[PDB]
Amino acid sequence: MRECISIHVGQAGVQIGNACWELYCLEHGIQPDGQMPSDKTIGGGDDSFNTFFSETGAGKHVPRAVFVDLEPTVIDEVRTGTYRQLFHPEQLITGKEDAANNYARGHYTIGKEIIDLVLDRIRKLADQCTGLQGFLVFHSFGGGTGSGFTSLLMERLSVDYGKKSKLEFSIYPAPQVSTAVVEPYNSILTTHTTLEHSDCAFMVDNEAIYDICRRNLDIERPTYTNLNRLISQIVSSITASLRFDGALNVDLTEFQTNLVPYPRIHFPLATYAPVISAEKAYHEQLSVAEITNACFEPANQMVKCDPRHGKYMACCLLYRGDVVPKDVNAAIATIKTKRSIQFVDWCPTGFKVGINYQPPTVVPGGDLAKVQRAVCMLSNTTAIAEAWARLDHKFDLMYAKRAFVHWYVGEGMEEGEFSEAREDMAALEKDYEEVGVDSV
Amino acid sequence: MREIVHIQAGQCGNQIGAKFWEVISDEHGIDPTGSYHGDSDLQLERINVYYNEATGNKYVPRAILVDLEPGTMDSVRSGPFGQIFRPDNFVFGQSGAGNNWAKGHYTEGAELVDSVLDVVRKESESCDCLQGFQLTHSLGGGTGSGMGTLLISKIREEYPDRIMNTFSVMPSPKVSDTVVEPYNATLSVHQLVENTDETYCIDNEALYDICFRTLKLTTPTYGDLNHLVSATMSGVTTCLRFPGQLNADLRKLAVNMVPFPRLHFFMPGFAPLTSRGSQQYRALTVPELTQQMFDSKNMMAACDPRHGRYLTVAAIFRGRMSMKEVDEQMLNVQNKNSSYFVEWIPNNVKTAVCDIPPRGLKMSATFIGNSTAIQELFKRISEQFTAMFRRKAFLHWYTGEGMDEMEFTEAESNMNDLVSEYQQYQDATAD
Amino acid sequence: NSQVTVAVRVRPFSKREKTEKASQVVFTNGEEITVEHPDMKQVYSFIYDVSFWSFDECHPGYASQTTVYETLAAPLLDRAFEGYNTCLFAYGQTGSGKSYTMMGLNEEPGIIPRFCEDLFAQIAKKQTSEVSYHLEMSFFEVYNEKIHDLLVCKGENGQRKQPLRAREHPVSGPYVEGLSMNVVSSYSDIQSWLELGNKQRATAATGMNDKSSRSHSVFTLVMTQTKTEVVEGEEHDHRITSRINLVDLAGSERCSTAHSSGQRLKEGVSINKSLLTLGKVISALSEQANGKRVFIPYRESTLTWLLKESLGGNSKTAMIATVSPAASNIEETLSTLRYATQARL
Numbered sequence A: 001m002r003e004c005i006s007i008h009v010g011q012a013g014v015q016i017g018n019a020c021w022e023l024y025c026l027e028h029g030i031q032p033d034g035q036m037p038s039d040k041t042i043g044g045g046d047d048s049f050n051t052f053f054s055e056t057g058a059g060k061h062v063p064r065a066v067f068v069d070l071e072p073t074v075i076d077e078v079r080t081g082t083y084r085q086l087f088h089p090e091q092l093i094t095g096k097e098d099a100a101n102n103y104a105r106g107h108y109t110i111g112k113e114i115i116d117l118v119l120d121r122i123r124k125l126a127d128q129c130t131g132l133q134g135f136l137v138f139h140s141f142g143g144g145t146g147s148g149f150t151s152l153l154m155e156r157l158s159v160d161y162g163k164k165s166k167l168e169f170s171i172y173p174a175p176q177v178s179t180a181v182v183e184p185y186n187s188i189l190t191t192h193t194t195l196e197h198s199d200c201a202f203m204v205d206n207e208a209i210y211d212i213c214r215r216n217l218d219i220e221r222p223t224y225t226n227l228n229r230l231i232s233q234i235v236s237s238i239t240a241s242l243r244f245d246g247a248l249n250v251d252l253t254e255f256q257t258n259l260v261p262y263p264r265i266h267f268p269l270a271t272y273a274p275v276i277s278a279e280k281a282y283h284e285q286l287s288v289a290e291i292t293n294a295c296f297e298p299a300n301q302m303v304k305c306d307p308r309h310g311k312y313m314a315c316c317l318l319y320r321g322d323v324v325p326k327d328v329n330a331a332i333a334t335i336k337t338k339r340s341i342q343f344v345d346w347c348p349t350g351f352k353v354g355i356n357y358q359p360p361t362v363v364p365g366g367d368l369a370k371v372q373r374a375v376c377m378l379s380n381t382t383a384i385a386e387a388w389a390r391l392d393h394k395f396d397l398m399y400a401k402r403a404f405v406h407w408y409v410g411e412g413m414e415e416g417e418f419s420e421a422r423e424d425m426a427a428l429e430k431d432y433e434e435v436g437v438d439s440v
Numbered sequence B: 001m002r003e004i005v006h007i008q009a010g011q012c013g014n015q016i017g018a019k020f021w022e023v024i025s026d027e028h029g030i031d032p033t034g035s036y037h038g039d040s041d042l043q044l045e046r047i048n049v050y051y052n053e054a055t056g057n058k059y060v061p062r063a064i065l066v067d068l069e070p071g072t073m074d075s076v077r078s079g080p081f082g083q084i085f086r087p088d089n090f091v092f093g094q095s096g097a098g099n100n101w102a103k104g105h106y107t108e109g110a111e112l113v114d115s116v117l118d119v120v121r122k123e124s125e126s127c128d129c130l131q132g133f134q135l136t137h138s139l140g141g142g143t144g145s146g147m148g149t150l151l152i153s154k155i156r157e158e159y160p161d162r163i164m165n166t167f168s169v170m171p172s173p174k175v176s177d178t179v180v181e182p183y184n185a186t187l188s189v190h191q192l193v194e195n196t197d198e199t200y201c202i203d204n205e206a207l208y209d210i211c212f213r214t215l216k217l218t219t220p221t222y223g224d225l226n227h228l229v230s231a232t233m234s235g236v237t238t239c240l241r242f243p244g245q246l247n248a249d250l251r252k253l254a255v256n257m258v259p260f261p262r263l264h265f266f267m268p269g270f271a272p273l274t275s276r277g278s279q280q281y282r283a284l285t286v287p288e289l290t291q292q293m294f295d296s297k298n299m300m301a302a303c304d305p306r307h308g309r310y311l312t313v314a315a316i317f318r319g320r321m322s323m324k325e326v327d328e329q330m331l332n333v334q335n336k337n338s339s340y341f342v343e344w345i346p347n348n349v350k351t352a353v354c355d356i357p358p359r360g361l362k363m364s365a366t367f368i369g370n371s372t373a374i375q376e377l378f379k380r381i382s383e384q385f386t387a388m389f390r391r392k393a394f395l396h397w398y399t400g401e402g403m404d405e406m407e408f409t410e411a412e413s414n415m416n417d418l419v420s421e422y423q424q425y426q427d428a429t430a431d
Numbered sequence C: 001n002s003q004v005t006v007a008v009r010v011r012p013f014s015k016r017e018k019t020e021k022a023s024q025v026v027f028t029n030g031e032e033i034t035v036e037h038p039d040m041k042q043v044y045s046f047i048y049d050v051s052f053w054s055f056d057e058c059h060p061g062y063a064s065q066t067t068v069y070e071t072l073a074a075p076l077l078d079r080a081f082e083g084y085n086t087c088l089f090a091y092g093q094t095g096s097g098k099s100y101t102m103m104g105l106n107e108e109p110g111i112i113p114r115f116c117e118d119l120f121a122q123i124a125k126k127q128t129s130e131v132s133y134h135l136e137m138s139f140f141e142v143y144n145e146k147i148h149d150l151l152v153c154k155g156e157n158g159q160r161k162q163p164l165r166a167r168e169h170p171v172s173g174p175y176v177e178g179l180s181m182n183v184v185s186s187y188s189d190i191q192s193w194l195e196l197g198n199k200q201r202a203t204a205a206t207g208m209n210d211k212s213s214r215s216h217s218v219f220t221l222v223m224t225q226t227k228t229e230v231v232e233g234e235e236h237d238h239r240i241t242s243r244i245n246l247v248d249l250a251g252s253e254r255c256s257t258a259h260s261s262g263q264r265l266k267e268g269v270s271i272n273k274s275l276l277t278l279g280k281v282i283s284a285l286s287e288q289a290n291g292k293r294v295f296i297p298y299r300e301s302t303l304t305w306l307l308k309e310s311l312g313g314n315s316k317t318a319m320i321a322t323v324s325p326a327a328s329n330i331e332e333t334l335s336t337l338r339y340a341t342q343a344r345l
C-alpha cells in the first residue's frame, strides 16, 4: 500500500495542517479520537487508508505527520484542541525560542538542537511503510522556520532518502501584502537550497485567495481558517488517486515528470475553480466546461500573476466527481481554440488529465458548497518570472545598504551567502526568458 | 517557555510597574494574595513569562526593585498589589542619587548593583529558557538613568544573547522637572544606544495631550498616564502569553524594526483610547484603530511623525479579526502616505494578531514606530547640553563624584552621530 | 577620486595542488578577473582598479612582490610625508597568500619589510639640522569587540589578556586607553615586536587548517615631523603627524559548512559583523567621494571607530584581497572578490 509522509513547518504549515487532517478524517470516516465507526458497516475492507493513516490492532488510526514549529504556541493548541487524541504525542514543540523571522536561526543556530529529533521521528515513520512514494512539506516562503528549517530538512532527506519525491506547498510572498520586512531575503535564501533538492513546489498567495473569497464566496472579512480549507481541498485533489478509485489515476511521480521540463523550473501555480457558496450553488450547473474555463481565468488563480504576461508550459487538471472524459476532451479543445492561452512551441500537447470518482467533502463551519464535481489546475508558467523579478528588486535595494543583515550574521551567516543566493536567482530569470524564446 | 525578568528603577519605574503588575494580573486572574481566581484556562498556560510558581498555587512576579531611596519601596508595600512581590527582591538604599547620574552609576549605585545582580542571577537561572530583560526607568532623575544603565551594561556583559527592551520616560520640550535632564539623558543615551535592542521612548507631555484631547480627562494623575504605558508594555508580550493567527515576539519585532543596530528608539502607541461618553458613538473596527494609531495625536514620544519618515512600523493586534482587513489597511497607509515612509524598504509595516483580547474590549491594538522625528528629541538635548557645558554650570557635582569632561564630550558626539543617522533617511527625494 | 583603491592577487598553485592537477578557476583579460566553475555553466566576472596576476612567472603582466609595493603601498608612504593619514587592509582566507603579500618570506619580502626600509632610507636622505623625523608604533588586536594589547607579556595565569577601552578625545579623535607606544629606529625593532605579538595573538583550530586567525590585528606607525623656520624665540614649533596603519583582517568562515558551537561561533559572528561594517564604510566613503552626502557608520565596530581619522577625511586607503585559483576552495574566493567589489562600488 502507498505511503506519503506529510511534514508541516511553522505557523503557516502547522495551521494549514489543521485543515488537511480535519478534511481527511472526514473523507475516511475517522473521528478526532482516532476511532472509526464506519467499520461496523462492513467489518473489514480498507476504508482506512495507509497513505495517510497507520492502524493499530485496537481500532485506532494515526496520521503519518510530523509538526515541527521551534515554538510551542501552535502545537500546544493541538495538544489541547479537538485533535489531541489523534496525533502521536511526538509533535516536535522543542522551541525554547522561535527563528525571529531569520533564516540564520531556523537553519543552523536554532534549527540544530531539533532536526535530529525530526529525522529520527521521520526514520520511525518510513520503517512502518512498505511502498513509500513521496514527501509533502507544507511551509511558508518568508518566515524563519519555514525558510531555513525546510531547507536544512530537505538537504538531509535528499541525503538519507534520495530517490524520493519531495513536493512543497509554500505561501508565496505577495507583491503588495506582506507581514514582515525580511520576507524577500528569506525567500531568496530558501530557494537557493531547495531548488537543488525539491521536485515540485506548489505556490499559493494569500492576496489571491482573499480576492477569491471576496468575489466568489462573498466573504468581505476573510481569515486564514477559510483559506487553509481551500488548500486542504487542493492537497485532497492531489492525494486522491492514492486513496480512491478512478479512471485516470495519477501517482505522485507523475507531477514530477509531466510538469518539470528542466530541474530548476518546478514552481507551478494552483487553482480550484468551483469556489462557490450555497447561495450560488444554484444558478449554476457546474459542468466541466465552465470549470476548465474558470481555471484559466486570470482571477481564479490562487497566486497573483497574470498568465497573459507569459506562456504556459505544462498543465495538470485533476478532476474529481462525476466526470466523463468526453467533457474534458471538449473542454481542452475549447482552450486551444482560444488565443489568450498561449503555449510554448515545444509542447503541443501541453495538458494532463486525471479523473477520480470520489467527490470533495464539505466541512461543517465551511464556506464552500456541496458539488458533484470539482477540479484542481496546477500549471507551470513563465508569468512567475515577473514575481521572481519583483522579489529580486526588493532584495536589491535593502542589500544595497546592508539592512537587517547583522541579525543574520549574528546567528551564523556570511555576507557572500546573500550575494551567492542572489546570483542563483538572476540565473533562474534567464532560464525562463530562455524557455520563452521560440524555436528556429 | 519564554521568560522575562522585569526590573524597575526609580520613582517612574516603580510607579509604572506598580500599575503593570496590576494589569497583567487582571489579564491572568491573579489576586493580591498571588492566588488564581480566573475563569478561562489560557492564562495559566503561559503565565511563566512574568510569574513564578510557589507552594500553595501562588504566583510571585519576577520583580527586581532597586529604587535608590526607601520611600518608593514603602509605597509599593503599603499599596494595592504589594503582597505578592518577593520580600528578598525589594532591594534599596538611603539618600538617593540627588538627581545626579554619577551617584547612581559610580558612587552610590556601585554599592548596590551587586546586590541586584544577586537577584537577577537568582531569577534568571530559575528559567528553562529566557527571552530577555524588561527595564522601566526614567531619563532625567539620576538613579533610573545611572543605576539603570550600569545594570544594563552588566547584564549585556553576562547575558549578551538576550533582549534588553527598555521603557524610558524622556524629558519633555516645553517644561522640565529637573534642571539636569539634558546631561543625564545624554549620558544615559550613550549607555543605552550601545547596550539595547528595542528602546521605547515615552514622554509625559504627549500623555497629557492624549488625556486632554481623546479621553477628555482634565485631572489626570500619573496613575492615568502609567495606565497607558502598561497597556503598550502588555501588548508587546501578548503573542508570548496567548495564542494567535500570526505570532511575534521581542526578537521578531526587533529583527523587523532595527535595520541598523542603533535605530532602536521607537514611538509607542495604543488603541482604542476613548472618552467615557463618546464610546456609544463609534464602531470598534480595524479602520478606526488604524486611523487612531497612525495619528500624530496618539503618539507618546513628543515628536510629530509628519516631520519625518517612518522607517519601520509595527502593529500588535488583539482580538478576533480578519487578516485581510489588517493587510489592506496597512497597505492603504503605505500607499496614501508614501512620503511619510521610506522608499528603499518596500513593506514598512509588520502585523501580528492574537485571539485573546483585554478584559473589556472586543479587540485592541498596539503600535511601535521607528521614525526620524525622534532626532528632534535628541537635537533639543544636545542644544541644551552644549549650552550648559559651554559654561560648566552644574558640573562640580558630577566631577566631585569621579567624572571627566570627556564622558560628556563622548556622549554629546554620539547623540549628534545618531541625529545624522536618522537624518540620512529624512530627505524628500525620488528614485 | 582615488580615496580608496582595492587590489586582488591570485597566488600560484601549491606544490601539492600541482601534484593533484587541481583545475584552474580564475582567468585574466588583463584587468578583468573571471571565475569559471569546473562545470562551466555560469561564469562570474569581476573588475577592479588594480589586479595582481601572480599565477605563472611568464604571463605578460606578472605581479611580483615589487609590483605590489610600487603600485599600492608606496603612494601611501608618500602621502605620509605630506602629513596625511593612510590605511592598508588585507583580506583573505587560509591559503590565500596574505602573509606572503604583507610580510613575506626571507627570500621574498612583502609590504612591511619594504615600507620599513624605504621609510628609514627616506629619513636618512631628508633629515637635516632643520627638519627631524620621529617614528612610534603600536600593535593591538580585536577579539569579540574587545581591544587587547600584544606587545606586553601576560601575568602568568590561565586567562588574562586585558580588555582596554576606546575613547574619543575631542580634538584628535578615537584612541585606546593603555596603548603601548614604543619608539622605533629601524626594522630590526619592528621585527622583534611583531614576532612577540603574533604569538600572543588569538589562533584556534576549527574544522579547517588547525591555525586560523580569529582576530583582527592593527599595527600603527605615527610619523611626527618637526621643522624650524627660524625666528628668534621658540624653535621647532611646527609639528605634523601622520598615522600609517597596516591592518591584517581575518576570514569570513560561514558556520554551516564549518559546524561550530560555543566560542568559535562567537568569534565568527564578530569577525563577520566587523567585516560587514567595514565594507559598508568603504562603500559609503567612495559614495561621498563621488558627489554625494551620506553618513559613515563608524560607530558599529571597534576597528572602523579607532581608524576613523585614518580611513576618511584627507586620508588614503588601500586594500589587498587574496584569493586562491583552485576549485577545492572556491566559495572563499567568490566571497572575497564580492567583498572587494562592494568596496569598489
Ligand SMILES: CC(=O)O[C@H]1C(=O)[C@@]2(C)[C@H]([C@H](OC(=O)c3ccccc3)[C@]3(O)C[C@H](OC(=O)[C@H](O)[C@@H](NC(=O)c4ccccc4)c4ccccc4)C(C)=C1C3(C)C)[C@]1(OC(C)=O)CO[C@@H]1C[C@@H]2O
Pocket (backbone or CB within 6 Å): B022, B023, B026, B027, B215, B223, B224, B225, B227, B228, B230, B231, B234, B272, B273, B274, B275, B276, B279, B358, B359, B360, B361
Ligand atoms: C465598558 C467600557 O468600554 O469601559 C471601558 C472604557 O470606558 C474605556 C474608555 C477604557 C477605560 O480606561 C480609562 O478610562 C483610562 C483612563 C486613563 C488612562 C487609561 C485608561 C476603562 O477604565 C478601562 C477598561 O479597559 C479594560 O477593561 C482593560 O482590561 C484595561 N484594564 C486595565 O488596564 C486595568 C488596570 C488596572 C486594573 C484592572 C484593569 C486594559 C487595557 C490594556 C491592557 C490590559 C488591560 C474598560 C473596559 C473601560 C474602563 C473601565 C472605563 C479605556 O482603557 C484602555 C486603555 O483600554 C480608555 O479608553 C479605553 C476604551 C474603553 O472603552
Ligand SMILES: Nc1nc2c(ncn2[C@@H]2O[C@H](COP(=O)(O)OP(=O)(O)OP(=O)(O)O)[C@@H](O)[C@H]2O)c(=O)[nH]1
Pocket (backbone or CB within 6 Å): A009, A010, A011, A012, A013, A015, A016, A071, A098, A099, A100, A101, A102, A140, A141, A142, A143, A144, A145, A146, A147, A171, A178, A179, A206, A224, A225, A227, A228, B245, B246, B247
Ligand atoms: N495561508 C496561510 N498563510 C499563513 C498562515 N499563517 C501565516 N501565514 C503566512 O506566513 C507568513 C509568515 O510566515 P510564518 O509562518 O509566520 O513564519 P513561520 O514559518 O511561522 O516561522 P517563524 O519565524 O518561526 O514564525 C505570512 O506572510 C502569513 O501570511 C495561515 O494560517 N495560512
Ligand SMILES: Nc1nc2c(ncn2[C@@H]2O[C@H](COP(=O)(O)OP(=O)(O)O)[C@@H](O)[C@H]2O)c(=O)[nH]1
Pocket (backbone or CB within 6 Å): B009, B010, B011, B012, B015, B016, B068, B069, B096, B097, B098, B099, B100, B138, B139, B140, B141, B142, B143, B144, B169, B177, B178, B204, B222, B223, B225, B226
Ligand atoms: N510617567 C511618570 N513619570 C514619572 C513618575 N514619577 C516621576 N516621573 C518622571 O521621572 C523623573 C523622576 O526621576 P527619579 O528617578 O524619580 O529621581 P530620583 O528619585 O532621584 O531617582 C521625572 O523627570 C519625572 O518626569 C510617574 O509616576 N509617572
Ligand SMILES: Nc1ncnc2c1ncn2[C@@H]1O[C@H](COP(=O)(O)OP(=O)(O)O)[C@@H](O)[C@H]1O
Pocket (backbone or CB within 6 Å): C010, C011, C012, C054, C092, C093, C094, C095, C096, C097, C098, C099, C100, C101
Ligand atoms: N605569489 C606567491 N608566490 C609564491 N608563493 C606564494 C604566493 N602566494 C602565496 N604563496 C605561498 O603560499 C604558502 C602559504 O600561504 P600563506 O602565505 O601562509 O597564506 P596564509 O598565511 O593566509 O595561509 C606560502 O608558503 C607561500 O609560498
Ligand SMILES: [Mg+2]
Pocket (backbone or CB within 6 Å): A010, A011, A071, A098, B247
Ligand atoms: Mg511562528
